[PDB]
Design a binder for this molecule. Sequence first.
Ligand SMILES: [Mg+2]
Length: 254
Amino acid sequence: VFLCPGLLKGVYQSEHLFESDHQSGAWCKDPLQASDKIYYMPWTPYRTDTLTEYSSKDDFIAGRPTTTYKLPHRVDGTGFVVYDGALFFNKERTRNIVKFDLRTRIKSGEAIIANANYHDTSPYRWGGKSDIDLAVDENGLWVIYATEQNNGKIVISQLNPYTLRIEGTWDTAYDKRSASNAFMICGILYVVKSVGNKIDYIYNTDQSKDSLVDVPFPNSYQYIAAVDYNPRDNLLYVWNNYHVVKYSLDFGPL
Ligand SMILES: [Mg+2]
């Protein structure tokens, strides 16, 4: 139902919402619902198992939550998405995605992402990245991971949010270790790298074709940031070194 905005060509911060008391975390809306609801999950290393819900941006900024959800498992890293009333997250130190129904507060499904690497981060690196990242876009729900079969390079799969069937899988050429964030727009994978920071690689799943690109991120962006795209409003939902902000996006023709 969402029309593709085009090929991403620019990124800039467009709203500062508040400074959180947690350095890292993730936040997002449910793009499949016409709703002001906001979902918020601060990252506490190896202890993350609650989701907070706010009814509006005003309530969010003011710190007036509606409710909290106690998740049935702990979450790996910062990642989660909400898609048509269901929460999806990577179960801590597994290659599993959990589906949790928010309305009834119970787990409705799990899917093992075949061959996905997990619990394999070098001792030295910041542990806030999820082994399997989730992303929502115009085309549906996505998992972004790596496999040994693809030499630690990023693999993309489309996941049906209702049946949990894998609908397609693509091997990219990009080493997952080199990425700070990855997100989908119109079925195209954008990968953010350190240089400053920029998108330097895209993978178009419709075409099964990748390219090198150069889209600078703001200087204030850090590696430890969490970034999620929203296809309903075409914004990036960002959590960056305590700061809860949105980025706006400029597009050119596909
Ligand atoms: Mg994300």
